[PDB]
Amino acid sequence: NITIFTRILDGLLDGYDNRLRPGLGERITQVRTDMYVNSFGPVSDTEMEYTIDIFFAQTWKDERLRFKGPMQRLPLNNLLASKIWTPDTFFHNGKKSFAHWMTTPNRMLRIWNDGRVLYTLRLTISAECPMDLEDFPMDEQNCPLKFGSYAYPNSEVVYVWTNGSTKSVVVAEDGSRLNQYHLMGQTVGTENISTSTGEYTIMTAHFHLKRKIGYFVIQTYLPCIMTVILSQVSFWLNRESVAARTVFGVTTVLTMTTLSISARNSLPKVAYATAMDWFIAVCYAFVFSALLEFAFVNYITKSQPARAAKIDKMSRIVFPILFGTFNLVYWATYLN
Amino acid sequence: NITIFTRILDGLLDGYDNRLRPGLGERITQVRTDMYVNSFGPVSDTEMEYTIDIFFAQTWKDERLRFKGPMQRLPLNNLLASKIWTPDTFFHNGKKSFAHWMTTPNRMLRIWNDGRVLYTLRLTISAECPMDLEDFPMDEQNCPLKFGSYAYPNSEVVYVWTNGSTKSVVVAEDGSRLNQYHLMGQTVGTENISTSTGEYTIMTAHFHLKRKIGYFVIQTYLPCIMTVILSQVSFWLNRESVAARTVFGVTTVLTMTTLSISARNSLPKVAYATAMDWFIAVCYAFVFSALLEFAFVNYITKSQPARAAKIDKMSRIVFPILFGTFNLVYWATYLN
Amino acid sequence: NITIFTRILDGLLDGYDNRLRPGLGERITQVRTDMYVNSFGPVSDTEMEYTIDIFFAQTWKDERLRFKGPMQRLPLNNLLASKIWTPDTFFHNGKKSFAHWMTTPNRMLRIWNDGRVLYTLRLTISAECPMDLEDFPMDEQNCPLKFGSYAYPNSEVVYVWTNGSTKSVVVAEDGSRLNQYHLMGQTVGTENISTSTGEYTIMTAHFHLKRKIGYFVIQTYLPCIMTVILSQVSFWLNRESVAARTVFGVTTVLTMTTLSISARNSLPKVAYATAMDWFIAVCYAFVFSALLEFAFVNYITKSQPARAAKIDKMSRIVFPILFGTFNLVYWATYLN
Amino acid sequence: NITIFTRILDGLLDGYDNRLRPGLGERITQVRTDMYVNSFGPVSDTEMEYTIDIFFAQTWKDERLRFKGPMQRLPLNNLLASKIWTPDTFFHNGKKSFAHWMTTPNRMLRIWNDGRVLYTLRLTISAECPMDLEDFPMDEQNCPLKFGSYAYPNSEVVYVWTNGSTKSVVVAEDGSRLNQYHLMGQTVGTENISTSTGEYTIMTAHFHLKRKIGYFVIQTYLPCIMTVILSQVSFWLNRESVAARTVFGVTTVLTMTTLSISARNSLPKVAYATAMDWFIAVCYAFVFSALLEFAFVNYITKSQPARAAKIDKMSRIVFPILFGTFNLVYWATYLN
Amino acid sequence: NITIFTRILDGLLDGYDNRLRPGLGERITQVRTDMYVNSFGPVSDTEMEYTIDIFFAQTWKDERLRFKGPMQRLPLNNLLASKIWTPDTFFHNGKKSFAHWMTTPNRMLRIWNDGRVLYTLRLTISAECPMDLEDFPMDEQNCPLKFGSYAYPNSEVVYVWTNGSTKSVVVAEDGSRLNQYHLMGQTVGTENISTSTGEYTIMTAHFHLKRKIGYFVIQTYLPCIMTVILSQVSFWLNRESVAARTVFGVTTVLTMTTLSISARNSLPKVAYATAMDWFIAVCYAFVFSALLEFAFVNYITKSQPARAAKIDKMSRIVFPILFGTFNLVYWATYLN
Numbered sequence A, B, C, D, E: 001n002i003t004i005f006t007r008i009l010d011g012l013l014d015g016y017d018n019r020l021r022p023g024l025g026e027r028i029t030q031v032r033t034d035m036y037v038n039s040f041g042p043v044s045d046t047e048m049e050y051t052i053d054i055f056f057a058q059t060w061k062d063e064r065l066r067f068k069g070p071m072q073r074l075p076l077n078n079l080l081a082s083k084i085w086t087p088d089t090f091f092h093n094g095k096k097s098f099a100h101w102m103t104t105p106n107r108m109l110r111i112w113n114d115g116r117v118l119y120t121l122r123l124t125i126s127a128e129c130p131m132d133l134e135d136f137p138m139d140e141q142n143c144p145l146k147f148g149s150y151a152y153p154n155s156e157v158v159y160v161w162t163n164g165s166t167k168s169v170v171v172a173e174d175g176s177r178l179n180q181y182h183l184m185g186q187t188v189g190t191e192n193i194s195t196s197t198g199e200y201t202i203m204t205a206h207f208h209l210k211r212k213i214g215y216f217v218i219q220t221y222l223p224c225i226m227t228v229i230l231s232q233v234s235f236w237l238n239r240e241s242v243a244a245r246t247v248f249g250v251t252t253v254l255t256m257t258t259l260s261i262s263a264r265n266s267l268p269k270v271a272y273a274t275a276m277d278w279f280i281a282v283c284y285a286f287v288f289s290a291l292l293e294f295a296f297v298n299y300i301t302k303s304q305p306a307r308a309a310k311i312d313k314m315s316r317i318v319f320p321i322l323f324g325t326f327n328l329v330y331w332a333t334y335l336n
């Protein structure tokens, strides 16, 4: 009884040229693409890339594969995939992509009576996500994913998303888990491109990333903030304690200096200043400014002691107020 | 005499279609799975993954392979595996998996008279283990391992564990060795899932991990604890020793600051506070609070010296008591 | 109707030897090469290499592939590429190169009636870019890319760029994005080389890189600059404050020392001094010189106090002026 | 004349089934194994693994390959290896193994008239070496190497070492070169194991490793030792020099703290204390104890000055003596 | 006309056994080897390895390939290489080697009328270079490269260099570029070896490496030197400035301590002392000795002040002289 299926499979490959697209010289081959993101892999800011694992499904029509039988479908696997024609889909921005071959190549091939073909493949892509770290770490990124044909122009093969955007791209609930980003949502689009070899259609999927702050607060902001507060303690000491106040100013300045170095170790080596860098620079100014006040005070503590006390006493109020005022401006500016 | 075996092997492949599952159009193919964990590889907290090496065995039934002969079994190897039908089993959460091909592909294939088939394979998986590091390092993790068919829905192929849980998954005595975790035990389960391509059965194996503390005690807690004790020594010095007490407070504060940075270097860049972070923050408060006491004392050591001595003398008792009290609360809270 | 195409493909391979170049014993095979740089990958200064992803296109002529049919072209893919002759092009300076095989090998093959052949391939090269870091970080680099035949000398196969330089090599707008370099432009050239196996033609593409300063300003120059300013503050303190001025000098000297170590951690281990190293050395001299002034002053503050005050007072003006003067010379020298 | 050899090779494969072991249904296949270690690769303590490159030779008997000819042997290569039966030998503890394929697969195949077969293969294994770092760095490790059949039980295939232990496993003179270990010697053994699939024989080779101390002496012990001596210098200063003695105690305590962190950076993150950790802890106690002496002395330098001098004077002798005494106990204990 | 070549190629493979070496049972196969080093890759001191990219050429004689035709040579590629016999050459000390397969396998195959065969291959080897870092960084290393047959003993296949040493091994002008070594020259040699499988001839190429100092001067020596000079400044301060002189001694000692740790981070973890280590140890002694002088001086500044001044004054001359004297001995000793 099972032998019925075997004959059908042999019949389909009879007089079938895997080197020719369906509808050749008759129409334009139309491919419907849907994607499921099993896990949105890590985002390497330094490399401006991101890893993603997907189940890439392509559907099209091939009248050469029509058949009649008891079943309306023919589940299969990678065994028969090489024997027929499949689109030469590739990822323009994919720096390095590989498939999964254990235990068996994660591929599927299904055929219906009408000739509709479903080809599902599992992939792990490593794409490039250019980023503008001007508002870092309060930065929103739009990491794209582009794919299309490599040899079939828009006049031969066209890719279109299936149904609406939600059904076109799907992300698993546990997949949207990252240590430094939030996956706000996804969008899809298409656009033709003109090249030397001809016009091609490009399918694009954009992932909206909202950086989840809180690691940098515990890593950079708080040490910078507490270091500033430490420096202001020097204003509560007597002027004659030259050695004591010197330690506060010197140690704090160096501490802020090393924080700038440590902070950017993980950050990419971008040739421009980020929001965090500005915060550090201001914090450096406060600690450095406190040291200057002590030096200026100690330089006139003999000639005009009266003014020195006023400056030292006044500084106990001005510095905390300005730093608190700056934080409101800084946080409000980048959080709104 | 040996030629008898050769004829049987040739006979089996006669009229055998490797593209068709057994029982097609007659019943549902049933697959029995057992696992042996040779070594539970390292767990990368930063990557939220874990490596595992297993001997993956699948058993099923295929009447097309029935035979009669002197032997009740036909030991074989990977040579004949490609010639017959095997399930398209794959690991949903496996980021990257590879097999072992030295000296020979670590595969086995055994067949009985009744048609029962045993397919054993050796694998090294790299799966993803999401973790909630809220109680870190007193955190218990449940790293799963999911697998199932890629192309055969629940109506065609079903995976079931063999015998009880203990016989279904086995871990070698030396395999359950990790530098930062204890492998408390294992559990298995099944659950259907609905997808666009149809309903599939998912087989899940969970490994219960209990982090073995002791590295962080020697790395973070003790330096934090001894640093606090160092700061309290300043209370035993005279107030007039402004420079001396300043060194204690300043150095200790910076020391705690760098410990926070160093501690999280290995830790993943999670955007929330762990139990260890709270311990550091408290330790930072104690050292910082000690410095404030000296500053406050030095600010009134002239106007009201009597109260300054009381505060300095009293602080010699309050600070050690509170820190000791906090540790009991902290350790008891996270150890119960 | 489609069967017409199938016959043509079969006819072409009839009596076709893939082991023989076209024009053999009749003329010299001529290959036209064009390149498109999808993304100019990262430049590793330490490894003196750079990654690049390109679409490498080669065009030539083969009379054995002439055909007549309704279409003037035969779009194809990697399936037929192995069946015909293609040049043995390789990259002399490519340390490690690999192709992209997902979803399908990123290859194309097109044939015209006259026999013209177009072979397009996608590659990710890792070439070596020797650099002279004498003006670092104000250094301009010329990273080349060499390719040619491996077995066919200049008397058999010749590579020539197609059209002008602009059309020969093209760089995508988003491809020319690097964190520490600017892609000023590109140039191409050819040159024969003589070897033991014969004379070969070498095609070279040079990429002009202008390092984008700004990361090192925030990383090395500013900490060095502010550290110098910190040291000069010691001149505004009284001589009798021996301990205070000692802290300024000692801490600053050590701070500059560690900056030299930290700065070169990312820099390659080159056995010569860069421009940045000279800047650090001068900054080290200023901080060190300030300490000597204090030591010299403290050594004669008793015998001849009058001169000590003059030196300390004078140093408040000389040191800032010289450092400012040096910066103008340094920046102007390396920026012009 | 050479054609004689060609006929013999063709004759051997005539009626030869590569899927059947020799002696099947007649006897037990016996395999003689010898090993030559070209280079004992690096030992990664963190990963508890070790790399090794070997020439793995297996010898057995197959009457199906008997032949008569002028020569008593038939040197060959990997070309014919796939055409005959070879044991499915694999390494149980090998996490990742690969072969060498340049310029040609490093394989050999030799056959004698009697049917004796020699199969030599070159491998680079990455095995797991569990270690007990309780006596670290005075620790001796026994890194094993296990191999056996994957599909042929003890009733079908048996592995036995050839000749004595010395001839069974051989290590090249230059191979036994490691930066942190001494290869004292090797031992071999066999042992049956019972599994679900049947009983198998396991061949084990153990390498005895004696860690070569001297890197940790220059890295950890000496800095710890000299830091302690530095602290004891504070006892030779006057009590009134509160600031001076404070610097000694504070800096030394922090210095020991960072050494503990730095020391364990390379060391694996084991959740227990090593011998080196105990040495550090004692060194921390000495430096910390010295600071307490100064604090205690400074706290009673007014009420009872006489006793303070005795304690300070006495400490100049007690501390050096105890530290020297401890070292003898520590070194003698772990070196005997 | 071109069909003439096709017939010759078919004729050559007629009755050709790729499994048999030429001259079998008639003579000894003789192989002439020449090498061209495109780029002498990086040398990893930690791994005691070095990467190298070469064009490996082997020439021999095979009378079975004689032919007559208009041309005296038959340029070819990897297509025909597998169809004939090639030596099983392999690299004994090559830990990991791989070939280049883009755009086409970098292989060549040329045949002359007389039967002479040229086989050229491109390789990227990763060999092991044991080193004795006793004179480091003034160390000269001899990194070898060994290759020979894997299955053909000296009685069957012999490797010999072609022409003189200069023509046998060639290094490209730009290839001999390293960041920490100079490629002084190359030498070649041969030597038989006896093994269990028989006697084999080994071809060895040695590369003489002279480390280019200058990175360690800027990284270790200068910071060590300037740190010593910093300590000697303490001798120019008054004895009563106890706190000031303490900072000099304490900070300098710790600074030298961390330099020892930092210096060896890149250096391999060898269990013996290098020349640089001795230099550091002496520098540590000078800074430590200076601190002892201050402590000794401060301990007798009351009982016998006169001698204290002499020691402090004398030390201003002795210490600089000895350090300068030591450098001449150290540099002259290791530079001659």
Ligand SMILES: Cc1ccc(-c2noc(C)c2COc2ccc(C(=O)N3CCS(=O)(=O)CC3)cn2)cn1
Pocket: A092, A093, A146, A149, A150, A151, A193, A194, A195, A196, A197, A200, C034, C035, C036, C038, C055, C056, C057, C120, C172, C174
């Ligand atoms: C599908 C295909 C494949 C091979 C080629 C090709 N063949 O020989 C050569 C020199 C090329 C480069 O032809 C291109 C390719 C891409 C683009 C383009 O529009 N981008 C924008 C989107 S992107 O993802 O940044 C990639 C670059 C322009 N010219 C053209 N088309």
Ligand SMILES: Cc1ccc(-c2noc(C)c2COc2ccc(C(=O)N3CCS(=O)(=O)CC3)cn2)cn1
Pocket: A034, A035, A036, A038, A055, A056, A057, A120, A172, A174, B092, B093, B146, B149, B150, B151, B193, B194, B195, B196, B197, B200
């Ligand atoms: C067996 C199979 C393979 C290919 C597909 C498939 N084919 O084209 C497309 C777009 C898909 C995605 O279809 C899926 C896949 C998985 C799930 C699901 O239930 N998860 C929960 C457990 S998990 O391990 O996190 C993986 C995700 C949902 N839809 C479906 N099923």
Ligand SMILES: Cc1ccc(-c2noc(C)c2COc2ccc(C(=O)N3CCS(=O)(=O)CC3)cn2)cn1
Pocket: C092, C093, C146, C149, C150, C151, C193, C194, C195, C196, C197, C200, E034, E035, E036, E038, E055, E056, E057, E120, E172, E174
């Ligand atoms: C195309 C080809 C391939 C195989 C060989 C070859 N075959 O056996 C052997 C020993 C060689 C080395 O023959 C060479 C190779 C290259 C050069 C040369 O001119 N460079 C300058 C430009 S480069 O990119 O730095 C590479 C080196 C000199 N001799 C020669 N020619």
Ligand SMILES: Cc1ccc(-c2noc(C)c2COc2ccc(C(=O)N3CCS(=O)(=O)CC3)cn2)cn1
Pocket: B034, B035, B036, B038, B055, B056, B057, B120, B172, B174, D092, D093, D146, D149, D150, D151, D193, D194, D195, D196, D197, D200
């Ligand atoms: C030769 C072979 C290969 C496949 C299997 C197998 N097939 O399906 C399944 C579930 C298994 C696991 O069967 C095992 C395997 C090994 C052991 C054992 O005795 N160890 C001790 C030495 S070891 O090197 O640590 C490896 C573990 C126990 N059961 C059994 N034997």
Ligand SMILES: Cc1ccc(-c2noc(C)c2COc2ccc(C(=O)N3CCS(=O)(=O)CC3)cn2)cn1
Pocket: D034, D035, D036, D038, D055, D056, D057, D120, D172, D174, E092, E093, E146, E149, E150, E151, E193, E194, E195, E196, E197, E200
């Ligand atoms: C050509 C070949 C290949 C396979 C074998 C072989 N086959 O089964 C086994 C156990 C061996 C090991 O046989 C050896 C191999 C090498 C040496 C030797 O002389 N060295 C010195 C130079 S070296 O480069 O350090 C490598 C080691 C000694 N015995 C012998 N000869």
Ligand SMILES: *[C@@H]1O[C@H](CO)[C@@H](O)[C@H](O)[C@H]1NC(C)=O
Pocket: A154, A190, A191, A192
């Ligand atoms: C691409 O070209 C086709 C030509 O028919 C056109 O219909 C389509 O709108 C184009 N796509 C875009 C985004 O312009």
Ligand SMILES: *[C@@H]1O[C@H](CO)[C@@H](O)[C@H](O)[C@H]1NC(C)=O
Pocket: B154, B190, B191, B192
């Ligand atoms: C999956 O579906 C089958 C349908 O027969 C059902 O018997 C089984 O209980 C289902 N599994 C679960 C976990 O619900």
Ligand SMILES: *[C@@H]1O[C@H](CO)[C@@H](O)[C@H](O)[C@H]1NC(C)=O
Pocket: C154, C190, C191, C192
């Ligand atoms: C290479 O050789 C050919 C020989 O015809 C010559 O025409 C060409 O100019 C040469 N190229 C260069 C750069 O000299």
Ligand SMILES: *[C@@H]1O[C@H](CO)[C@@H](O)[C@H](O)[C@H]1NC(C)=O
Pocket: D154, D190, D191, D192
């Ligand atoms: C393994 O089993 C065989 C059965 O004949 C026995 O002879 C041999 O001694 C056993 N090996 C060990 C180590 O017990």
Ligand SMILES: *[C@@H]1O[C@H](CO)[C@@H](O)[C@H](O)[C@H]1NC(C)=O
Pocket: E154, E190, E191, E192
């Ligand atoms: C190797 O053996 C051959 C035997 O003929 C001999 O001629 C040759 O000199 C030997 N090589 C060396 C280096 O001894």
